[PDB]
């Protein structure tokens, strides 16, 4: 069965993200068939909790001939912030809906910048409410405004598919508008490279437990985050301290020996020659040369409200919070933007972080900020720095 792609609709409020979303599910339904669905029943997005953090999120699926799509759509700007930083709704591409009327509005920019921070790799634009727009080559000088903005945060604005349409008329059933819908589904099909499967990525395993087998080496355990480890392959141990190289002489699971550990599985991996006291929980095992240890990086951080597990009072830099990456805690110091001292609950900000030791990480790694025995923040690494 088909390859799976994660999209959702992003962009400023009441520009049409929710109607577009229903229009799609309703066009492709009357076209190829399947399930159509109601604006009413999409707009009133249910609450679901990603680790204490509550987000209002509707999840719609539709099918093109070549692809299955999981579409995410949210009611408030805040939902989009929490969802994007959190990973609760990772996207292989976003549909940026801009109203023909207003032009890029304040969330338009923020949803693009946040898309870059959080590692959304492709954006496709839909100029909406065109049925409202009456004459001229504004549609054209607006398709330019959207392009400079898009290139302003590093997306190929010049190469960007921009579809003009009316989500309402398309949902009402105007055939010439049901058209730009199907045209848009073509662009998801054509412009978003089908995403790499986890089992296809280089091997990575966050280390949970470590014990010796005397006379053989040491065993480290965890859930394979991605890739395949096969018996006989070299691996590295990365983070927290000096990288080391080893060979995998075996893989076990539930007391059974295997030829390999695969993404998704909890496994033991025996490392020949390595001794116990030189591996720490918090290190990772990884295909050699595919992930590096950094101590410094740039992230986007959302400060939890009290309701979702943090504090009703603002977070102040300068107190050395704990950053939690995969399996461990490690102290860091923060630099905030210029002039800013604190971050209000429910707000998000950019943070440059310097840890006290190295952690294996690339852009897009998630993490939690703790301080005083309380999870106060959720972050994503936007760019590794050293």
């Amino acid at each position: 069965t088909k390859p799976h792609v994660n999209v959702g609709t992003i962009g400023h409020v009441d520009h049409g993200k929710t109607t577009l979303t229903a229009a799609i599910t309703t066009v492709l339904a009357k076209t190829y068939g399947g399930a159509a669905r109601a604006f009413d029943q999409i707009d009133n997005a249910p609450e679901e909790k990603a680790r204490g953090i509550t987000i209002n999120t509707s999840h719609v699926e539709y099918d093109t001939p070549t692809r299955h799509y999981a579409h995410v759509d949210c009611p408030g700007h805040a939902d989009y912030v929490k969802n994007m930083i959190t990973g609760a709704a990772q996207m292989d591409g976003a549909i940026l809906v801009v109203a023909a009327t207003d032009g890029p509005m304040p969330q338009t920019r923020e949803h693009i910048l946040l898309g870059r921070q959080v590692g959304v790799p492709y954006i496709i634009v839909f100029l909406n409410k065109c049925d409202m727009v009456d004459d001229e080559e504004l549609l054209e000088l607006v398709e330019m405004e959207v392009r400079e903005l898009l290139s302003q945060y590093d997306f190929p604005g010049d190469d960007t598919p921009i579809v003009r349409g009316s989500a309402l008329k398309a949902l009402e059933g105007d055939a010439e508008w049901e058209a730009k819908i199907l045209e848009l589904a073509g662009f998801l099909d054509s412009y978003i490279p089908e995403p790499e499967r986890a089992i296809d990525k280089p091997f990575l395993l966050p280390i949970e437990d470590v014990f010796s087998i005397s006379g053989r080496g040491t065993v480290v355990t965890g859930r394979v985050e991605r890739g395949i480890i096969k018996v006989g392959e070299e691996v590295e141990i990365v983070g927290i301290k000096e990288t080391q190289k080893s060979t995998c002489t075996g893989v076990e699971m539930f007391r059974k020996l295997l030829d390999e550990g695969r993404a998704g599985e909890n496994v033991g991996v025996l490392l020949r020659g390595i001794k116990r006291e030189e591996i720490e929980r918090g290190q990772v095992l990884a295909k050699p040369g595919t992930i590096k240890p950094h101590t410094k990086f740039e992230s986007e951080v959302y400060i939890l409200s009290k309701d979702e597990g943090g504090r009703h009072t603002p977070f102040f830099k300068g107190y050395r919070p704990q950053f939690y990456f995969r399996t461990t805690d490690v102290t860091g110091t923060i630099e905030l933007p210029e002039g800013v001292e604190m971050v209000m609950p429910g707000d998000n900000i950019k943070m440059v972080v310097t840890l006290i030791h190295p952690i294996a990480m690339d852009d897009g790694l998630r993490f939690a900020i703790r301080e005083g025995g309380r999870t106060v923040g959720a972050g994503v690494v936007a760019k590794v720095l050293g």
Partner: peptide, 12 residues
């Protein structure tokens, strides 16, 4: 190793 239904564990 050490596990056997679903926790972290192993052997080699």
């Amino acid at each position: 190793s050490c596990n056997c239904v679903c926790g972290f564990c192993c052997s080699x």
